[PDB]
């Protein structure tokens, strides 16, 4: 057995002694109320215990008995609909059995066994089973939440229970291998669910904004990231995957989401109804986020227990949208480790483990077909911040800018009316040569052509921008204000979108397609306006610029007929004048 | 522009990097000094197995 | 009374014969100055412990030292009736009369509030500054730091929010005037003028019989600059939640906080990791700010207003760093409008806001400033920015169009942002606002709707 | 056994009876989860070693710890049948075929070539590109970095030109059938897309039947990252020096390699250098670019090309500083080209080879190549400055000469820089050049000889 | 002495069984005898700075030490003689190891396996003057005067006739005892005694008008050429020494480029002197280090050359030292001082940089020796 | 400090006035800095000793006029600037210490003034 007591309790961490048989990165039970530690170092019979819950009364000579599980995540149903911790404890059970205050040493079931779930078997008792094979279909709302065989386990069946409710603990398929397949099954958080092969991303993910796709495309099965210095719109950009994503499985998880930000965002889901589902938004949101009211060391666990949950979903055969809300918070939590263990991290205030545990998080799942023949795609978006306000640091380069999309925010940029805001130049996408197939065939064979063509104009204005701030234009010409005004309209209506309004943005092909064709029209004719002898001053004073300036309020349903009537007005109020 | 450039602008846009630089650099004295004392602890600990 | 020192220097002591001490425990001690001080067992060890004294050592011999475990956990007596009474960081009343008897003795470490137990608020208040109550909308259970530079006032502006803090009677569709409104204070480092300046505006407020003051001076120990914050907020928890009153808490001198934070930062074992400040800083600014929030089942609330005083106008400085991220919706002060004589000198051009169409601007919060907020932004911008662009392009060069931009700058700022001893209600704001907005013809006023325009014509 | 454990901080492990074990060894460690893990044996004492687990950081325990001493010295078997193999990382089966065959044993850490037996370049490689064969001239056995940005994709422009390259040395008189070509690619930190995007292209046209691949996955620890270049470096040796092949090393993203290093050193009690990046780098970076070049009496040679990423491409970063001394000349990718969509992004203006006369000569690349290279330099450069004068003053108010120098630049990006994946020869690239230069009068041709003008217009 | 290895961290080795160890002592760590050096002792163990990287070394081996401090080797064969920063002959490395270099290489530092000419310029019963007259070697450069090192003014016995004698063979011995051979050892960290340090007053020709006639530094200057090489600047460096009035040239780099630095070496015999009318190679000493060369090779680079020029000075020759890549010299030093307690404290470089920087110029210039002869050590500081 | 103390003897007592013409304090800082880099006084302020003023205190102390005895001792520091900028401690700290300053700039050097 593993036994021992507290030697030196210092900070949220406990340093034990007398530890015999203790193994690295394994769950424990710590104190006398159960706070749960992790062996994060050995030095013979002393092992630095890291205790995810903060200490407050615990003292010398108290128990330290390690369980002997490899911080296993308990996989099963009941994930959908219901808040959970980053350390996986349902918050429902806490609020009802304590009070409204979070107290240290609250220990409840990680995966509830105060629930039962209707079983439909499918597998027959005469067959054999295979790792990654469906045993039946548990009906959780409108979704199909299959039950699979844990990888690295197979046998031959001999019995299969008939339909009825059963507790997740009870078996529902038994085998000749000495085992019983239950809907309660261990899989480590340090070991990935096995994949059949890796697939090349080649379908893009629709993140339903006309600037987070159209200009800088993001991939399905991809990875992407957005930063945000000092609260510039770090939290707000997940109101753009709130429901304007095409995922069938949405996992909102936060490394640390402060108290005020779960007063609006976390309560937002039971107050909404997703239109793709047709049913509620919380049906399709897992919820496994962590608060900053929740201890500092719980912030460090967060990432590895929700990534595996993302894999569990990916396996079933559903699009998974995982987005780690402010991944920057796991870094401070990781960095606190050094202080407490007598070590000093990576220089210039950088975390002690850089690439190692960042590259790992991102590549754990992502564009992979499974053992079981289903299509796994994981779209992961890091919503980091630079702690010191520099976008030039190791951890941004290794895995936050070498991904599918890199984006940026300025501080007076977003304040005008762009919510969220992006830098037109300084922001690129690496993946864009692999997102060209679907966009060609499905949308149109000039959707990849027009989207590079809009980006050209947007970044060419930059050419003149500089000289404006050097000594200015003291000469306005016909070819001058051409690029300049156009580009203006483009930044005014196409990058000022709001995520608080469903009329200023929404997930829809045709809105993106449409708006971008209106602008094409205004542009097209303007070049042939000047030649004839039409002053750019009058170009402003056509009402049609205002028609394109009232496409960002238009009702979604109305847009088709609206667009068709408006394309004609451009071409009429240009060629006439 | 010429006049202006050779005074306020140009060496000013210089002194900005310089000021920045030096303070980034000097910060890393505390790094090394702390890291020093860290080292001292580590060795001091393996020196209680073999002595006092 | 355990004797045997090993290290003494500052409010961190180490003394042996210990293992009976727990994390977060009240001890007492003896010193050679013939006085009995305090000590929180912040850290615990094999045959010693780390102690944190509630006073500066200025004398402590090694013949006479003591330790006596008073209590296992660490606490403060807190009772219902303590309103009308003043206090200090030690926790003794400074009134001159016997200390009141507790109902609960609650820990001073703080118990966090469930994110599940809150829900979106929507009842707004009059701060007596127009600019806030339009752009950010200061509602209960919400933070809104007022960023302040060094060489800038901090005291002046703060006072304005304290004597003109008042719920709407039904301007939002309801009141909370039906339940007592009260205020809590706690200063973390104050001089000779800031002491009296605050007290004499609380007699303006008319509140000194329904407020709890936890004044910490700079002549008071430097260790109580980080004790007092937590401490104060537990007397917030007691009176908002469990005795149903809407309590305004106002925290100032969160730079004097940070002085004391730094001390433990490097003098203890732990190493710096936030560009020359600690790395357990996060927790120190989490435990503080995250307590506050309107809880769903309670009528009452803790509305916290942080008031910074941060070194210069750097934004890489530790303080504005973490504070930014934490709070939802922010307000800034600068030196653009403090050279003009405009008190308060709020500037929202670099400032940011994240709640203004997020359970606010909609709901039981009026929609008649909904589109106004969105409009004011890009309109105020057109202003400020081109004031810079003019001195490059020409020296007076501005085109037909841009002329109008800059015309709306000087005007809006003067009228609107000078409030101070002048209160404006929800209605009074919008009227005036629209009349400066008539300076721009239709086409920049796309964001305001057809209704809005006529509404407040 | 080797029982005794002290510190498993991260991916450390200590073991007793470190006296048989040595520095620069590699070893099997036995743990109770059944895992087989390499790990170089570093910082050896006579009581305590440091070993660094090639598999995760989870499963280490203090009950089962043993070490099978493989061989004290750095080892790695080399084969000559590596010319159609495929491997990822260290050298593990992705071709399904055996990893190594021992025909010789060479370490991955030795002491590079005498300079007395180093020859200079005299042949050339054709990548099928324009600008990296005309304006800058890469030749057979050459050191030449490709400076990319992190905003920019390193990785694409890497593998593109990879498969695309087919040697051509006709004009010198050596064939493609008296010159074999071996493409060695060694990457690190590649994502799920990038890892599959490579193998596919390579397999597309024959570039994996005449090449051997390496690419270190992002699921792998940072200890294997390091051995990756040193690995493929040592293989490149046994081919070109000892069987007469002309290899091409393409390293991809040097930054990731240097990051990794930093963590190994920090646990090997050393202080990192400037900007917080390794200061013990100079040596390690040297041996990778200096264990290539030509050889006297052997026609083969390893040509060295590294690719690195830079946050803004500045020189303030250590990453270019170091490199830029040991390597000759420079290629650098700028933002302006790439944004607008030009591939390759290579701008000839920051670029300049330091060796273009000490590589090939007259008659080996046609005689006109020399002066036609310093024509196109000055013709282009002039025009990128009057693009920001194309509408201030215009081009209609500008001289005749300068008007031509505009259009010239535009057609240069379209036809010369860009060609995507199309191949080109020395002769077809000089063809493009002539046509573009016919537009300029003979009066504006003064950067070539009278011989060259009368050679073609 | 002889001791046993205890630790191996990095390229550096630390080994106990040392006692009575000298400072800057000859160390050949292991049974592989990697060229190393004893430094800063600690306890009954020492810290050992090993230039050549270690990766085959195991702990617990025997460590042979000479017990005499490392010195610069000075004898014949240096004129028209290729050596590196450890001062081994890079071409007899090519013949005895092949194209590639496999560490633990030790060969003689001068060509000692040749039979070199001799003529006695002194006799028995006369007394010698230090820094001057012993005997000359006729060579095919000019001459090379093999002179006795300073502070050795005693009586000589047994001076053997003009013929051919190996470097290790004796031609002379002293009457008062203490034997001497043609090879001489002079300390790496010390400079030879002078009588006055003069003032510069003979202009230093560079063979191109504008260079010296407009801006002279004369003979005993200290100059500099900034900006990195590859701008055709190397034109200047070669032709400089090539035309310039001297009788010996010493070329030295450290951290210099790849193949561009090997173009220089082969093109060096293809440079031609105006005075002799034949190659510059006849009368050139190389001690260049490339960049594949060992850690501290480059760091020791400087000091070698300085010394070596002072030898030619004492003889009555004019030397022309060319300090290529002064900036890259610093690279190595930073690395070494990091792993010790000489940690950075200035600005991205150790503060002992300025100390090691000075002495290179301080101990060169146009001065008169104990032997009474003149010569100059003009330095041109390519910082780059 | 030798130059200094030595002179105080001959200065006051024998009554002869002397002016100590001290040259580059650059090389002073430079050399000083090495020592504190192995005893861990950790020099740095901008990369120059942060204990600088401390040592310069006694050294430049005698530079005014005494009472009683005639003849005196007067310091004349002479040192370059690495940059015009008075940010780096080479001219900055030296500034504060001493009594006023006199720069020669480069504003007239440039013209041929001497």
Curated annotation (Swiss-Prot), chain A:
Its EC number is 7.1.2.2. One of its GO terms (cellular component) is proton-transporting ATP synthase complex. GO terms for biological process: proton motive force-driven plasma membrane ATP synthesis. SUPFAM superfamilies: C-terminal domain of alpha and beta subunits of F1 ATP synthase (SSF47917), N-terminal domain of alpha and beta subunits of F1 ATP synthase (SSF50615), P-loop containing nucleoside triphosphate hydrolases (SSF52540). CDD domains: ATP-synt_V_A-type_alpha_C (cd18111), ATP-synt_V_A-type_alpha_N (cd18119), V_A-ATPase_A (cd01134). InterPro entries: ATP-synt_VA_C, ATP-synth_a_Xtn, ATP_synth_asu-like_sf, ATPase_a/bsu_AS, ATPase_F1/V1/A1_a/bsu_N, ATPase_F1/V1/A1_a/bsu_N_sf, ATPase_F1/V1/A1_a/bsu_nucl-bd, ATPase_F1/V1_b/a_C. It is an enzyme of class 7 (translocase). The keyword Transport applies. Pfam families: ATP-synt_ab, ATP-synt_ab_N, ATP-synt_ab_Xtn, ATP-synt_VA_C. It catalyses: ATP + H2O + 4 H(+)(in) = ADP + phosphate + 5 H(+)(out). PROSITE patterns: ATPASE_ALPHA_BETA. Disulfide bonds: none annotated. ATP binds at residues 228-235. Keywords: ATP synthesis, ATP-binding, Hydrogen ion transport, Ion transport, Nucleotide-binding, Translocase, Transport. One of its GO terms (molecular function) is proton-transporting ATPase activity, rotational mechanism. Belongs to the ATPase alpha/beta chains family. NCBIfam families: PRK04192.1 (NF003220). Produces ATP from ADP in the presence of a proton gradient across the membrane. The V-type alpha chain is a catalytic subunit. This is V-type ATP synthase alpha chain. The gene is atpA.
UniProtKB/Swiss-Prot annotation, chain B:
Belongs to the V-ATPase D subunit family. GO terms for biological process: proton motive force-driven plasma membrane ATP synthesis. This is V-type ATP synthase subunit D. It comes from Thermus thermophilus (strain ATCC BAA-163 / DSM 7039 / HB27). Keywords: ATP synthesis, Hydrogen ion transport, Ion transport, Transport. The chain holds residues 160 to 211 of 223 of the full protein. Produces ATP from ADP in the presence of a proton gradient across the membrane. One of its GO terms (molecular function) is proton-transporting ATP synthase activity, rotational mechanism.
UniProtKB/Swiss-Prot annotation, chain F:
It comes from the Bacteria. Produces ATP from ADP in the presence of a proton gradient across the membrane. The V-type beta chain is a regulatory subunit. Belongs to the ATPase alpha/beta chains family. This is V-type ATP synthase beta chain. It comes from Thermus thermophilus (strain ATCC BAA-163 / DSM 7039 / HB27). The lineage of its organism: Bacteria, Thermotogati, Deinococcota, Deinococci, Thermales. The gene is atpB. The chain holds residues 236 to 349 of 478 of the full protein.
